[PDB]
Amino acid sequence: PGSMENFQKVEKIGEGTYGVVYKARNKLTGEVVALKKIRLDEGVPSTAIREISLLKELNHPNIVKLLDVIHTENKLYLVFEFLHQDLKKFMDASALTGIPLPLIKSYLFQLLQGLAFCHSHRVLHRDLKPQNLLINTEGAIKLADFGLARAFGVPVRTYTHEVVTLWYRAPEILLGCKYYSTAVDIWSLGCIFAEMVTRRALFPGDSEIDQLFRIFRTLGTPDEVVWPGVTSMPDYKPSFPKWARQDFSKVVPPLDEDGRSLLSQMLHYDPNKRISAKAALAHPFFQDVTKPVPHLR
Amino acid sequence: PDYHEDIHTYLREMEVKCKPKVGYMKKQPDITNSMRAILVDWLVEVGEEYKLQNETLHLAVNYIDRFLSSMSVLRGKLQLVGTAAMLLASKFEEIYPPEVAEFVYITDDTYTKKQVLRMEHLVLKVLTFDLAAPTVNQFLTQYFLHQQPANCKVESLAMFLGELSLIDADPYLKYLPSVIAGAAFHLALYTVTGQSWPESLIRKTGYTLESLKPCLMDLHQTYLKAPQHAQQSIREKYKNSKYHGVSLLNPPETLNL
Numbered sequence: 001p002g003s004m005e006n007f008q009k010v011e012k013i014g015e016g017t018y019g020v021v022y023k024a025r026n027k028l029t030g031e032v033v034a035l036k037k038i039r040l041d042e043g044v045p046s047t048a049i050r051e052i053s054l055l056k057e058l059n060h061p062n063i064v065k066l067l068d069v070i071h072t073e074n075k076l077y078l079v080f081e082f083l084h085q086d087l088k089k090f091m092d093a094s095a096l097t098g099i100p101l102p103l104i105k106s107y108l109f110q111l112l113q114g115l116a117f118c119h120s121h122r123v124l125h126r127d128l129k130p131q132n133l134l135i136n137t138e139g140a141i142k143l144a145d146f147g148l149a150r151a152f153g154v155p156v157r158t159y160t161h162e163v164v165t166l167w168y169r170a171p172e173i174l175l176g177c178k179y180y181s182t183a184v185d186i187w188s189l190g191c192i193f194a195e196m197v198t199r200r201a202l203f204p205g206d207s208e209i210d211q212l213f214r215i216f217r218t219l220g221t222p223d224e225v226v227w228p229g230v231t232s233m234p235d236y237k238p239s240f241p242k243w244a245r246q247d248f249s250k251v252v253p254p255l256d257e258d259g260r261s262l263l264s265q266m267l268h269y270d271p272n273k274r275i276s277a278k279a280a281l282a283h284p285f286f287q288d289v290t291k292p293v294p295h296l297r
Numbered sequence: 298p299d300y301h302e303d304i305h306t307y308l309r310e311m312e313v314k315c316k317p318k319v320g321y322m323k324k325q326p327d328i329t330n331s332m333r334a335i336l337v338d339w340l341v342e343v344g345e346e347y348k349l350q351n352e353t354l355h356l357a358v359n360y361i362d363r364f365l366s367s368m369s370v371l372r373g374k375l376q377l378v379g380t381a382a383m384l385l386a387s388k389f390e391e392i393y394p395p396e397v398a399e400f401v402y403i404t405d406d407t408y409t410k411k412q413v414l415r416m417e418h419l420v421l422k423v424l425t426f427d428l429a430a431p432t433v434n435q436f437l438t439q440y441f442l443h444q445q446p447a448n449c450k451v452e453s454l455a456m457f458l459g460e461l462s463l464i465d466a467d468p469y470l471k472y473l474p475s476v477i478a479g480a481a482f483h484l485a486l487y488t489v490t491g492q493s494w495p496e497s498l499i500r501k502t503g504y505t506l507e508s509l510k511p512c513l514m515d516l517h518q519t520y521l522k523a524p525q526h527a528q529q530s531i532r533e534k535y536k537n538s539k540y541h542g543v544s545l546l547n548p549p550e551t552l553n554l
């Protein structure tokens with residue numbers, strides 16, 4: 001534990017799931033840190049309760065490092081190691097030619113490690129999107145912002161149905177299944193993988209039905225053959241337009257045979273058959289994976 | 298299903314770390330095993346009133362026992378601890394937790410809002426924010442997957458016994474959650490079907506009938522002496538069809554061990 005005396009604020013970075021994130025500097029050690037401020041003034045929000053407790057258990061090279069919790073009066077701080085930038089802001093600063101496939105390959109590989117770790121420790125992230133992923137200058141990438149995260153049990157119960165920002169939300173959530181699980185986070189990584197390669201979001205819908213219809217236009221409209229029990233799901237409609245599944249060479253053109261294979265397994269409709277983060281690490285796509293460095297913005 | 302084994306391994310690692318001190322009640326100068334039984338039973342009623350998950354009950358109890366493992370509390374403040382813990386359990390576990398004002402409501406207006414919110418703060422400091430604790434409930438649901446075949450009556454009965462184990466710190470504070478879940482599952486399985494602690498679980502948990510015996514003996518006595526116990530909210534609860542009315546079933550006479 002710590003004292004806010006030791007820290008000196010540098011700049012405000014932005015809002016997250018909850019609270020405002022700041023850049024700060026430790027005056028004695030010289031370490032640059034990230035500070036997440038929450039004004040308590042209904043008590044500690046369940047988001048902070050969830051994020052702190054889960055993040056104290058999750059020590060992995062690819063999950064953001066929580067260093068300390070400062071529990072002063074009326075105000076609560078979270079101290080993180082500072083890396084350089086979030087993936088959203090990085091893709092904004094990156095020129096069109098700026099993100100090489102070896103770097104994408106590396107990022108995905110690392111993210112799958114962070115996700116395999118989380119799921120091995122009964123944690124669902126439930127908000128994987130570019131803004132919640134952070135990079136450093138040496139080639140590392142880390143999952144962050146566990147404010148929407150929760151601990152799941154085996155087997156899973158019914159949990160909150162709000163979950164996941166729209167563009168990255170799995171079909172089982174949209175169609176309102178009683179149970180969702182580890183496979184929702186895989187889906188989001190699937191969309192992120194495609195986003196990094198094409199430099200634009202895979203399914204940028206504005207509503208739920210718009211999101212569904214965009215998924216069907218790319219992957220084909222699901223039926224009982226591709227996904228058993230889909231016609232029984234609460235928000236499924238028999239009136240859904242029938243679109244054909246299209247070639248992944250045309251969905252993500254710059255991607256080789258191995259890359260296409262993995263993405264299709266990441267975007268598989270049936271969450272049962274959808275590839276696990278663990279099993280993905282052994283995919284032939286990563287046979288030649290290294291650790292390249294990004295540009296400095 | 299790709300993570301069942303990792304998760305189970307991890308929960309067995311954490312249950313030891315999250316375990317409260319066994320003989321803390323003797324170090325408590327004002328509260329007693331009887332008073333804790335009344336508090337736990339009262340929280341069962343609160344759970345049923347606001348229709349909360351069983352997991353939230355088990356989580357609250359874990360927090361109280363850990364908090365009382367290093368902090369002394371006068372009898373008049375025990376309910377305040379219990380309230381704040383239930384508030385924290387609900388925030389961690391529930392989709393729609395009851396708002397603070399409702400927790401002030403069920404404390405028969407003994408404590409104020411600020412007091413509840415300041416006790417929430419303290420518990421978090423003492424528990425040092427470590428809330429993701431394993432429970433009897435979390436091992437039970439994993440055990441149910443080993444039924445050949447699955448039986449609803451068994452499941453509800455095992456959850457009934459595990460819930461009963463929360464009441465009496467003596468002797469249940471000395472047994473780990475995975476062990477109690479072993480005893481609860483076998484005892485439920487033998488009462489309903491007549492079958493024993495299955496081989497696949499011996500392979501999975503490393504727990505044999507002999508190792509479960511010490512706990513199984515205590516639990517069997519709690520099941521038989523249940524209608525005489527001073528606290529009754531768990532028997533009442535489990536009369537419901539939601540729990541298949543398992544608390545109305547007759548306990549077995551002998552375990553044959």
Ligand SMILES: O=C1N=C(NCc2cccs2)S/C1=C/c1ccc2ncccc2c1
Binds near residue numbers: 013034036064082084
């Ligand atoms: O980066 C973080 N993002 C969080 N949630 C959403 C946001 C993204 C960007 C601003 S807010 S919490 C969080 C903590 C954190 C940790 C390390 C960092 N290193 C470099 C830059 C920002 C960092 C933020």
